[PDB]
């Protein structure tokens, strides 16, 4: 019943994308911010980082029982052999989709775009982040599409490090005038040993360590023990 490596890995990718989409459209109101999958012998565990953990778990875990009741009936998980976990996000300034969903459900509640954008900006740069770009395009008011940018701090715009030092989230807002498209790009400062930013330093920059002092006696001396 075995299947090739390419097909099984693409199936795992399909499965993960399916979970991502379902949980993003299902728990965006409850601040869903990420899904991870681990495997133990004859057991699959799924841990869901969320901004609002009290709203992603529910009373007595019932929603989780509901949640596993849904997933187990889609991807082929036999009844009672799958468990769902959730951890609070360490900081909302290391993930872009969290602030993306925050912007969604701040504008969907009825709110000037600028106020929410500036609130997110000050939240991000009180989080020690090194740069935040919130681009909002659509019709802010009237009947014309103007793209506005809320740009704070420096941010890398090219190269390899954009893979890890920059985290990006795209989102759509559905108001009664139309659709507002946002992109949130958050740069991660250098935090080796501590998991806030990337562990590796910025590849193009060089730092020279402070000098080591000298002790140069003019008259040679020996140090017996």
């Amino acid at each position: 019943v075995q299947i090739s490596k390419k097909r099984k890995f693409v199936a795992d990718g399909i499965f993960k994308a399916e979970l991502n989409e379902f949980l993003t459209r299902e728990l965006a109101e409850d601040g869903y911010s990420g899904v991870e999958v681990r495997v133990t012998p004859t057991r699959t565990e799924i841990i869901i980082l969320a901004t609002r953990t009290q709203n992603v778990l529910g009373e007595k875990g019932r929603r989780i029982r509901e949640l596993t009741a849904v997933v187990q009936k889609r991807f082929g998980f036999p009844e009672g052999s799958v468990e769902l976990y959730a951890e609070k996000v360490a900081t909302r300034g290391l993930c872009a989709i969290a602030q993306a969903e925050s912007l969604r459900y701040k504008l969907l509640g009825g709110l000037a775009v600028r106020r929410a954008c500036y609130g997110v900006l000050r939240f991000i740069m009180e989080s020690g982040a090194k740069g935040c770009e919130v681009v909002v395009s659509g019709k802010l008011r009237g009947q014309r599409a103007k793209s506005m940018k809320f740009v704070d701090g420096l941010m890398i715009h090219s190269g390899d490090p954009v893979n890890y030092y920059v985290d990006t989230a795209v989102r759509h807002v559905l108001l009664r005038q139309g659709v507002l498209g946002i992109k949130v790009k958050i740069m991660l400062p250098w935090d080796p040993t501590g998991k806030i930013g990337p562990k590796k330093p910025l590849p193009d920059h060089v730092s020279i360590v402070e000098p080591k002092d000298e002790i140069l006696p003019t008259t040679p001396i020996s140090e017996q023990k």
Partner: peptide, 30 residues
Amino acid sequence: TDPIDDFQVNWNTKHGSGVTRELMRELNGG
């Protein structure tokens, strides 16, 4: 709503005078 932000965005719009007045209210007086 932060009137500094409202002035930054809407100063050149139909509500430029109103956001200017609100900004001046916030800037001095407390």
